[PDB]
Each structure stands twice: as C-alpha cells, then as structure tokens.
Design a protein around this ligand. Structure first.
Ligand SMILES: Nc1ncnc2c1ncn2[C@@H]1O[C@H](COP(=O)(O)OP(=O)(O)O)[C@@H](O)[C@H]1O
Lengths: 49, 49
C-alpha cells in the first residue's frame, strides 16, 4: 500500500509533461515560418497565391 | 474541321497564358527571398562595426 501511492503521485505529473510536449509539436509545425518560401509554411503558400 | 480546330486552339492559348504566370511567381519569389539573406549579412556587418 505504501509503495502503491508513490506511483500514482507521479502518474499525473508525467501525463502533464506528455500533454505539454505533444501540443508544442503540434503548434510548431503550424509555425508558418515566412522564411521557408517553399509552401511548407502555409503563409508563404498564400503569398505565392 | 475549321470550327473544331480553332476551338481547340483558343482553349490551348489560355492554358499557356496561365502557365506563364506561375513562372513569374517564382522569378519574383526568389528575388524577394534573395533580398532577405543579404539583409541578414548586413546585420552581422553592422554588429561587427
Ligand atoms: N534561420 C532560419 N530559420 C528558420 N528557417 C529558415 C532560416 N533560414 C532559411 N529558412 C527557411 O527554412 C526552409 C526549410 O526548407 P523546407 O524544407 O521547404 O521547409 P521545411 O523545413 O518546413 O520542410 C527554407 O525554405 C528556408 O526558406
């Protein structure tokens, strides 16, 4: 029982880190960097249009 | 044939007109891209001053 708690007290902490990084990856790919000039950034794709 | 042939000819010409525009886009796009790099080099040169 004492060993049981030490696991649960950390599980929530790991999930938070996982949700933080996974979201960060999602945001960055949509960065739409203006410098790409290759349509990889959706903004520069608009500029070409 | 004469009526049919010209109809094909007119259809082709606009396709040429559309394609040539895309060439201009890259010609302008790279030129804008070119100016960006030298600006960065200027920053280092200005910083080196
Ligand atoms: N200092 C920089 N930081 C980020 N991106 C840059 C920098 N200098 C140039 N770039 C851009 O990064 C892009 C990488 O090319 P590309 O493979 O088309 O994009 P992606 O990395 O999205 O596949 C280039 O098109 C270029 O315009």
């Amino acid at each position: 029982e004492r060993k049981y708690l030490e696991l649960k007290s950390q599980k929530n902490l790991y999930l938070a880190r996982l949700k933080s990084a996974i979201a960060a990856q999602k945001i960055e790919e949509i960065a739409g960097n203006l410098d790409n000039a290759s349509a990889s950034s959706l903004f520069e794709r608009i500029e070409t249009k | 044939l004469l009526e049919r042939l010209l109809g094909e000819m007119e259809l082709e010409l606009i396709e040429l007109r559309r394609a040539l525009a895309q060439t201009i886009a890259t010609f302008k796009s790279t030129e804008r891209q070119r100016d960006a790099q030298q600006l960065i080099a200027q920053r280092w040169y200005e910083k080196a001053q």
